[PDB]
Amino acid sequence: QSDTHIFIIMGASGDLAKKKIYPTIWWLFRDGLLPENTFIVGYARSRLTVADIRKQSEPFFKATPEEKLKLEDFFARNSYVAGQYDDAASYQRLNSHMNALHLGSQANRLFYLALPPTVYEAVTKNIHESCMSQIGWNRIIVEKPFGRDLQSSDRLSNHISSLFREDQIYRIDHYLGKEMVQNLMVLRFANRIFGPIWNRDNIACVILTFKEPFGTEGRGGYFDEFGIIRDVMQNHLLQMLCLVAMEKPASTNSDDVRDEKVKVLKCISEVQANNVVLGQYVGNPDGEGEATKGYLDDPTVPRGSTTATFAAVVLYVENERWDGVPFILRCGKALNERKAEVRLQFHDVAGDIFHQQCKRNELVIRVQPNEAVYTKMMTKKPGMFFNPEESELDLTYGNRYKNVKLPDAYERLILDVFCGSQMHFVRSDELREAWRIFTPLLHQIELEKPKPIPYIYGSRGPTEADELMKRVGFQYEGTYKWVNPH
Ligand SMILES: NC(=O)c1ccc[n+]([C@@H]2O[C@H](COP(=O)([O-])OP(=O)(O)OC[C@H]3O[C@@H](n4cnc5c(N)ncnc54)[C@H](OP(=O)(O)O)[C@@H]3O)[C@@H](O)[C@H]2O)c1
């Protein structure tokens, strides 16, 4: 478009703006992906100049010498307004500043809230009252947390919705910006090989996994307030569940997609303790550096905290496609690897003619690291043998698409806000369902304070988690052997 566009970084002085938002909007700018007439306005409490923003942020830009002119033009299009987050006069100054930009009263305005949630309500109120374009569109970009339970999320939502239409609100769940998460829809709905088997007649279980190999890294006191279910399970994992489970949408229009996601969540009952395993990591005495330290060995964590650093939970989608199929959500810190993954395990073939030698087929979508899709399946054992053995059909992006840069999630998502595409942003009704599913459990945990099961730093987590997975119908043999073909 030829319209002026203004990108307002609310909280421009903070760490997140410095290390992530300023570098992302630079990358989009550098790559020629933004509108020609774009300006960037920082707003925060400190009395900073553009030269200070540049000094703090440009080390994270990965700028090259050849980009020097583009960089000069980028900083020429930047400005900074000092102000407080609930001061009417400050927002007035911000509005006037924006009006003074080239066609500024006409401009489309995008507000990125690079702020803590304790100022969300004051910032949204003030933007609405003072800084909205009367001609351009107005879009607000908000990051987690969105409440900490159903009642607290409803309060924020009801505040924002009283001021902003759903088509002005862009709630980030950054998994929705990742390459292979966005692929889930194409894989499922562009292919006949995945279509007729994607149902309860063929699928024994679905496993949605998020593992990190580091602990809390001295920042445990922050984590301790919310825990792993609020951090990862209620948002990122549940989003992956929705994209795995959803019926095929009427179109790829933003709200046809998000309608199908909500429809999935509305069929999920509130999870109970029965289907939950919680863990907390302890130090590995045979380990090195951080790995010798448990969760309670972080001095910012409250003494005797029972906060879980690991959760496995089983949900069920109560509908025709999914009736009975367990969806296992599993996540933890200080585990054996970094990995996020979707895995479908297929049922056994009926009418076995291979004398119980066959294993269940599996489809794996590995989100990170090392983006890949593969199907574990049976082939005749190569050479002079007749017995089936497990093998796979593989697609690895690092080998197949060596030269192709995959954008960071924040690159993709910020660009989507410019384009007005809400497909990959969390809708108000979707948010509410997510909290409805998990709030009873979260409240029970806060009330009864169950003691999480210790697991050692660097392990796969508590063995009770594997037991839960087996109980609900996941089969593990440990016979599959993969050799990296390179
Ligand atoms: N293109 C590629 O890069 C590619 C393609 C094919 C295979 N491979 C590699 O080959 C290796 C094996 O592949 P895979 O992980 O798909 O198959 P797998 O080793 O058969 O593992 C299947 C699943 O079982 C889980 N598990 C492990 N022990 C368990 C237990 N005792 N009880 C219950 N569940 C258990 C694993 O958990 P975890 O998630 O905790 O391990 C994994 O989720 C992996 O390293 C994989 O990365 C790579």
Numbering used by the authors: 28 to 513
From the reporting publication:
To elucidate the molecular basis of the reduced stability and activity of Canton G6PD, we examined the crystal structures of WT and Canton G6PD at 1.9 Å and 2.6 Å resolution, respectively. Although no NADP+ was added to protein solution prior to the crystallization, both crystal structures contained NADP+ at the second NADP+-binding site (structural NADP+-binding site) in the β+α domain. The overall conformations of WT and Canton G6PD were very similar, as indicated by a root-mean-square deviation of 0.6 Å for the superimposition of Cα atoms. In particular, K171 and P172 are the key residues involved in positioning of G6P and NADP+ in their binding pockets. We further mutated the R459-interacting residues, D181 and N185, to alanine in WT G6PD to determine the importance of the inter-helical interactions and found that these point-mutated enzymes are biochemically similar to the Canton variant; they exhibited about 20% of the normal activity, with lower KM values for both NADP+ and G6P and lower T1/2 values. Taken together, these data support the importance of the inter-helical interaction between R459 and D181 and N185 for catalytic activity and stability of the enzyme and provides a structural insight into the biochemical defects of the Canton variant.
Reduced glutathione (GSH) provides the cellular first line of defense against oxidative stress-induced injury, which can be maintained by NADPH generated mainly via the pentose phosphate pathway and its rate-limiting enzyme, glucose-6-phosphate dehydrogenase (G6PD). Accordingly, missense DNA mutations that impair G6PD activity or stability result in increased oxidative stress and a spectrum of disease phenotypes featuring, most commonly, hemolytic anemia, and collectively called G6PD deficiency. Each monomer has a catalytic nicotinamide adenine dinucleotide phosphate (NADP+)-binding domain and β+α domain, containing an additional binding site for NADP+ that structurally stabilizes the enzyme. The glucose 6-phosphate (G6P)-binding site is located between these two domains.
